[PDB]
Design a protein around this ligand. Structure first.
Ligand SMILES: [Cl-]
Ligand SMILES: [Cl-]
Ligand SMILES: [Mn+2]
Length: 296
């Protein structure tokens, strides 16, 4: 993702090289070019205007009009604004002695494989995770998680067809006690579309299990729809953080750049490949650098 935006931002910066000091009108032209690059990447007008305004303020504060290398000043201020847009500092869910987290999202989001990859990540960090396959309607969805848990070496409790939330809670508590589990990852039902009956189920399960995090998994390649999905889950269930999958796919890029501003939720993890280790903690500064051609 973000190949076109990357090329357009780098080109806007590059057009400032080899010209000496620039004028106020030159600076305004570059700012318009940056806003256009963002909007072509499907960033909305409000988000893009705010971004450019931050670039303008910071560049003026760094003396851009007096610099012999204004391209470098713009590079630095775009880098900071991108790093800010994407979340600022890297963030992860808080671990306490015991933890129960939901994963929520649509079928095509990579939610179930994300649950397994998260479990593997945390097992490698010394946690003792339990996966819970919580689709009370679809046995195949539960079996998919069983098999992935087997592959990553993490136990899986599967709910029963039509099992009540209270029964799920009892069985999860029992297994977690017998197996000394300290991180419970509940993979909730995935559907192709949002559904009143489904949202009512997720909200009820949340009341009964009391998760401390609700992680919404979104396929980043779905564009502005991902922010609409995020709004629906946050309104009907309540979300604490995001996981963006398929960030390596061919797509424009603005969900990720538009998420802090629009949703107020941190992006915790990024899916950057299909390998079992392809899910990594999200680092806003490293994505910002890579968009601008810096680093790896
Ligand atoms: Cl479906
Ligand atoms: Cl999605
Ligand atoms: Mn209720």
């Amino acid at each position: 993702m973000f190949q076109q935006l990357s090329a357009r931002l780098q080109e806007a910066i590059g057009r400032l090289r080899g010209r000496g000091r620039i004028t106020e009108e030159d600076l305004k032209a570059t700012l318009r070019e940056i806003r256009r690059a963002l909007m072509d990447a499907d960033v909305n007008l409000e988000v893009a205007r705010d971004f450019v305004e931050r670039v303008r303020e910071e560049a003026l504060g760094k003396q851009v009009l007096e610099s012999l290398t204004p391209a470098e000043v713009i590079l630095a201020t775009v880098y900071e604004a991108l790093k800010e847009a994407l979340g600022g500092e890297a963030r992860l869910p808080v671990l306490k002695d015991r933890n129960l987290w939901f994963l929520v999202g649509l079928q095509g989001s990579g939610k179930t494989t994300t649950a397994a990859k998260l479990a593997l990540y945390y097992k490698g960090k010394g946690r003792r995770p339990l996966l819970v396959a919580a689709d009370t309607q679809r046995p195949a969805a539960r079996e998919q998680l069983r098999l992935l848990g087997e592959k990553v070496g993490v136990p899986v409790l599967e709910v029963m067809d039509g099992e009540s939330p209270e029964s799920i809670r009892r069985r999860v508590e029992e297994k977690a006690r017998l197996e000394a589990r300290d991180l419970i990852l509940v993979d909730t039902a995935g559907r192709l579309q949002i559904d009143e009956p489904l949202m009512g189920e997720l909200a009820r399960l949340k009341e009964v299990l009391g998760p401390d995090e609700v992680l919404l998994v979104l396929d980043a390649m779905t564009g502005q729809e991902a922010l609409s999905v995020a709004r629906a889950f946050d309104e009907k269930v309540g979300v604490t953080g995001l996981v963006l999958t398929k960030l390596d796919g061919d797509a424009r890029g603005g969900a990720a750049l538009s998420a802090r501003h629009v949703t107020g939720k941190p992006i915790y993890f990024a899916g950057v490949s299909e390998k079992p280790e392809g899910l990594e903690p999200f680092y806003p500064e490293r994505l910002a650098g890579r968009i601008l051609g810096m680093g790896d």
